[PDB]
């Protein structure tokens, strides 16, 4: 359910998380020291460990003779971008301070403190359908850093579930939505807003950035109560834009929330009801208005069980 560990290199994190998944019944179609093709009852995913980063992609079928980025219905070729790039999570060379892993039969969440105050999330799973009838729903998110030393959360940066970024090559997260607007079932919609593509998706990923496009943003800003110092969980609703520019609410992120960390220290819990919450910062602790050099006070909350 909740595991903690350490890793000097990304390969160690990779080995440990596969060990955990296998111990929990996760089905790995093909495994190696650096490359994974795995699946569950919900979807198929493929991962590869680089020297200092992780490459992730979704999948719809399996072929052992195809490369890690060439599986049937892979997101590389079936996406609106002209660049045709897969999901990237840019890590460091290590050693990593620690890693915190949430494992379930339907989703896998990871938060790695690579260095003092430096954190990277890696998210995989399927959105809670909540009774809505749609095929797909599998989401894969990584973390990207623009340039060290300069504004780290600059406009060109992309983040999990992000609603605003400028980049023509790579995406930080992606969501499956099948048969949208009469197209072929395999459709891997990225989180983009400026490409003006007919079909796309959007989320609260950046939190409370000045130009974040989501109507629940104010809730995150207001997630903290000054009168009683109480904090609440805000569902992470995702939105989809179709051909006629007519949006459709698609769902919420399972067991996940976003909040303001103004009055909380990293890891400080606040039990709301019978369920317990673990809160950690996205990238690093800074001030309220430091949207350039850090991730301000946005905090990711996971339900610990």
């Amino acid at each position: 359910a909740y595991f903690t560990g350490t890793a000097n290199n990304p390969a160690d994190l990779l080995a440990k998380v596969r060990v955990h998944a296998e111990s929990l019944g996760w089905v790995t179609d093909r495994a190696s020291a650096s490359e994974w093709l795995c699946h569950n009852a919900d979807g198929y995913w493929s991962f590869n460990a680089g020297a200092n980063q992780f490459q992730m992609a979704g999948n719809t079928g399996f072929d052992n003779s195809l490369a890690w980025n060439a599986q049937p219905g892979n997101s590389v070729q079936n996406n609106p971008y002209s660049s045709k790039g897969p999901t990237v999570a840019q890590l460091s060379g290590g050693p990593f301070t620690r890693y915190h892993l949430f494992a379930t039969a339907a989703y896998l969440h990871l938060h790695v403190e690579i260095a003092a105050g430096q954190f990277r999330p890696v998210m995989i799973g399927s959105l809670n359908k909540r009774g809505v009838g749609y095929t797909g729903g599998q989401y894969v998110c990584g973390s990207f850093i623009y340039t060290p030393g300069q504004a780290l959360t600059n406009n060109w940066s992309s983040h999990p579930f992000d609603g605003y970024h400028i980049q023509y090559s790579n995406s930080s997260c992606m969501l499956r939505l099948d048969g949208l607007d009469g197209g072929p079932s395999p459709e891997w919609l990225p989180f983009d807003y400026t490409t003006n593509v007919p079909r796309r998706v959007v989320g609260p990923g950046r939190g409370n950035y000045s130009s974040q496009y989501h109507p629940d943003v104010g809730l995150i800003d207001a997630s903290a109560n000054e009168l009683n110092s109480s904090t609440t969980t805000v569902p992470c609703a995702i939105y989809a834009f179709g051909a006629q520019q007519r949006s459709r609410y698609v769902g919420e992120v399972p067991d996940f929330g976003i909040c303001n960390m103004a009055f909380l220290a990293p890891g400080d819990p606040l039990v709301v009801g019978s369920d317990t919450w673990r809160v950690y910062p996205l990238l690093q602790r800074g001030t309220a208005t430091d949207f350039d050099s850090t991730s301000a006070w946005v905090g990711y909350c996971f339900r610990v069980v």
Binding site: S210, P215, D216, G218, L219, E226, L227, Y249
Partner: protein, 317 residues
């Protein structure tokens, strides 16, 4: 707890409202009925219709709360309106009323009034009520007037904030208006404008919420709003997802309406509307009923326009 009907006139409509509040089988069986602490007709009607004044007490679901509300009927034949005014309070004392004047000043921590616009004629009407909040909707031809008041649901224990009273009406009650008003200020609960929704702060000071700014309104309320329809604060474009929202494969998503205040002193989340949500327009409209998890929801639209951002659903239970 719910009644759909047609009242022959405004006086009969108010009579039916009170009969519903005191004799609905659910209310009496569960012992949730309200108490009329006051009922009077003080003024000497000239070229105007008779004025009814009522003050009722609600005990809440648990029987340990104290809710005080006031209703009024005020009309003028020459201008041809039969407005219904509403207000809320915590205490009442008929002896506190000064000579002449009015009784709504006798309320302790009195709040300004809101209203609904009607006239003397058969009017289709929809009443919803629960021990903590009441909602009124009236179908005037192609227009829908709507108002109500009650307790919101804060995320904190009631022990320290026992009194989260909110009042909402289609237009401010400080002026007399004719229901044929076409101005943008005549609007609904989901989008207050120009003193159309008030909420009582835990400090005991009433704060007004507006989804859009206004010079005539006081500066303090510009900072506090209903975020769902107030997405324009953070977005850098006129057109956003909220105005382009639409159903999903026949499923209509219900979005909760949220109070929020963003002051310089500090931030605070206050709560949600109990039984009110936002819903889209395309392929749908008012009088529609949608069933979610075995619970039905009715649809309504604001008088000014029936566009996407002006269309809200109310839970009927």
């Amino acid at each position: 707890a719910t009644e759909f009907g047609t009242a022959v006139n405004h006086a009969d409509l108010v009579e039916r409202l009170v009969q519903f509040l005191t004799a609905s089988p659910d209310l009496v069986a569960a012992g949730q009925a309200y108490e009329k602490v006051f009922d009077n007709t003080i003024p000497a009607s000239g070229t105007a219709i008779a004025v009814r004044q009522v003050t009722l007490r609600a005990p809440g679901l648990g029987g340990t709360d104290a809710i005080y509300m006031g209703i009024q009927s005020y009309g003028d034949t020459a201008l041809d309106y039969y407005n219904l005014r509403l207000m809320g309070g915590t205490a009442f004392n008929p002896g506190a009323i000064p000579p002449g004047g009015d009784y709504w000043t006798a309320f302790a921590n009195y709040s300004p009034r809101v209203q609904l616009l009607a006239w003397n004629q058969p009017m289709p009407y929809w009443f919803f009520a629960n021990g903590r909040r009441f909602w009124i909707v009236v179908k005037v031809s192609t227009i829908y007037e709507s108002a109500g008041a009650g307790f919101i649901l804060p995320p904190c224990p009631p022990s320290q904030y026992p009194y989260p009273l909110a009042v909402v009406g289609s237009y401010r009650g400080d002026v007399a208006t004719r229901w044929s008003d076409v101005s943008d200020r005549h609007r609904g609960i989901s989008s207050p404008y120009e003193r159309s929704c008030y909420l009582r702060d835990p400090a005991g000071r009433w704060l007004g919420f507006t989804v859009d700014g206004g010079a005539a309104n006081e500066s303090d309320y510009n900072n506090r709003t209903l975020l769902p329809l107030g997405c324009g604060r953070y977005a850098g474009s006129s057109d956003t997802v909220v105005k382009q929202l639409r159903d999903s494969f026949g499923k209509f998503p219900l979005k909760a309406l949220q109070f929020v205040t963003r002051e310089t002193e500090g931030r605070r989340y206050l709560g949600d509307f109990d039984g009110a949500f936002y819903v889209p327009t395309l392929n749908s409209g008012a009088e529609d009923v949608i069933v979610e998890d075995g619970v039905d929801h009715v649809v309504f639209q604001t008088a000014w326009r029936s566009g996407n951002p002006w269309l809200y659903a109310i839970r009927k239970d």
